[PDB]
Amino acid sequence: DLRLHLLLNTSVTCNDGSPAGYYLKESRGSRRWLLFLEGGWYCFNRENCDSRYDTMRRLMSSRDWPRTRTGTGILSSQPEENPYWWNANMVFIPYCSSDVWSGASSKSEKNEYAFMGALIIQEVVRELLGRGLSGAKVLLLAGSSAGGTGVLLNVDRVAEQLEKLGYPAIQVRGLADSGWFLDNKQYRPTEAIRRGIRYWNGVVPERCRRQFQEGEEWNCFFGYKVYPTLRSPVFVVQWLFDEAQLTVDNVHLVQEGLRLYIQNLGRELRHTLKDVPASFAPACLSHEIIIRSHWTDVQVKGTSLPRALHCWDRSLHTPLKGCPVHLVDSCPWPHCNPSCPT
């Protein structure tokens, strides 16, 4: 079990002004630290956020959070469930800012809600330094869905934070699961993120901001546009037929028009990953993986995801014999990979 700690700086808050926080399980024999960002879509205006507060309140408030959480998948401490990093220090950071981890705005006389996702990450890092993170060798910032996009938006800021505070020996890396989307034509979203960024006072990485310039920062929420600008090592996990991608594309599972649409989506996703040297992209219809207990089961070209992440670690000590890091399926239809989840 990971134990809850509410942030000591109570001005860093969830949407409703309650304190943000993190769940922690220390492993004092280890100098590896895994900080996982939870997902769960977002909200982009007052009416839309009001509805989320009514029926998704744990994603907006800490008032009802439980004292403990069980670590699963990559957050498990059991070698059989987590062959990759079972002995690491484990941190789960709840998503209670509804801003894809981008916001830097407090609740005030003019703001019903606080959107502080980018500041929550930095405050968690600061408070962990006094609980052992100061001695770390590797900080892996991981996340799923909106949290996977949050990794891409925040990994270089964490690296700069630690350099500026005087911890040059901590190697910061990212793991982005199910947060790599296409701004494509629907079969039958960009306006929501354009509105949301203004509502949240959302912030994106500096090099990406300088490329796209004022008014166009929404571009940096799409993985294939923000990833080339990043300096920290980032491993990308993305199903080729992601269920959230197909939902916003208005695809519900076939005649020729839809067959061609689905095949083109997989081809485009595979193209965006061609120059991503650390990646895992199976030809499956699914969504999220790294904190699911059976994340050990899927394989690409005979290599599992925990193995690919271990090979990535070795590469950061040129290609390794029998230990690949770039694993993208070539077959063109969901479940042409026999190891896909059922």
Ligand X SMILES: O=C(NCCc1ccc(O)cc1)c1ccccn1
Residues engaged in binding ligand X (CB under 6 A)? 100, 146, 149, 179, 181, 189-190, 193, 221-222, 244-245, 248
Nearest CB to ligand X, comparing residues 7 and 104: 104
Nearest CB to ligand X, comparing residues 246 and 325: 246
Q: How far is the CB of 183 from ligand X (least distance, A)?
A: 7
In sign, the C-alpha dihedral spanning 291, 294, 298, 303 is positive
Nearest CB to ligand X, comparing residues 27 and 201: 201
Q: How far is the CB of 195 from ligand X (least distance, A)?
A: 10
Is residue 294 among the annotated active site residues?
no
Measured CA to CA, the distance from residue 338 to residue 342 in angstroms comes to 10
Nearest CB to ligand X, comparing residues 21 and 143: 143
Q: Which residue is nearest to ligand X (CB)?
A: 149
Nearest CB to ligand X, comparing residues 193 and 208: 193
Cross-strand partners of 111: 108
Give the dihedral of Cα atoms 69, 41, 43, 35; nearest 10 deg.
50
Tokens of 185: 């034509």
Q: How far is the CB of 118 from ligand X (least distance, A)?
A: 14
Measured CA to CA, the distance from residue 84 to residue 39 in angstroms comes to 22
Q: Which of 258, 224, 248, 223 is nearest to 333 (CA)?
A: 258
Q: Under a CB-based contact definition with an 8 Å cutoff, are residues 52 and 110 in contact?
A: no
DSSP letters, 279-306, are EEE-S-EE---TTSTTTTS-EETTEEHH
Tokens of 130: 């006094």
Residue 91: C-alpha distances to residues 60, 68, 94, 219 (Å): 19, 12, 10, 29
Q: Which of 287, 304, 326, 329 is catalytic?
A: 287
Nearest CB to ligand X, comparing residues 71 and 150: 150
- Phi then psi for residue 177, to 5 deg, are -110, 120
- Which residue shows structure tokens 């134990």? 3
Q: How far is the CB of 218 from ligand X (least distance, A)?
A: 7
Q: Which of 145, 279, 286, 304 is catalytic?
A: 145
Tokens of 275: 């120059």
Is residue 106 among the annotated active site residues?
no
Q: How far is the CB of 30 from ligand X (least distance, A)?
A: 30
Is residue 287 among the annotated active site residues?
yes
Q: Which of 99, 156, 177, 242 is catalytic?
A: 242
Mode of pairing for the β-strands spanning 68-69 and 21-25: unpaired
Measured CA to CA, the distance from residue 212 to residue 289 in angstroms comes to 31
Task: Residue 108: count other Cβ atoms within 10 Å of its Cβ.
Answer: 9
Q: How far is the CB of 28 from ligand X (least distance, A)?
A: 35
Active site residues: 145, 242, 287
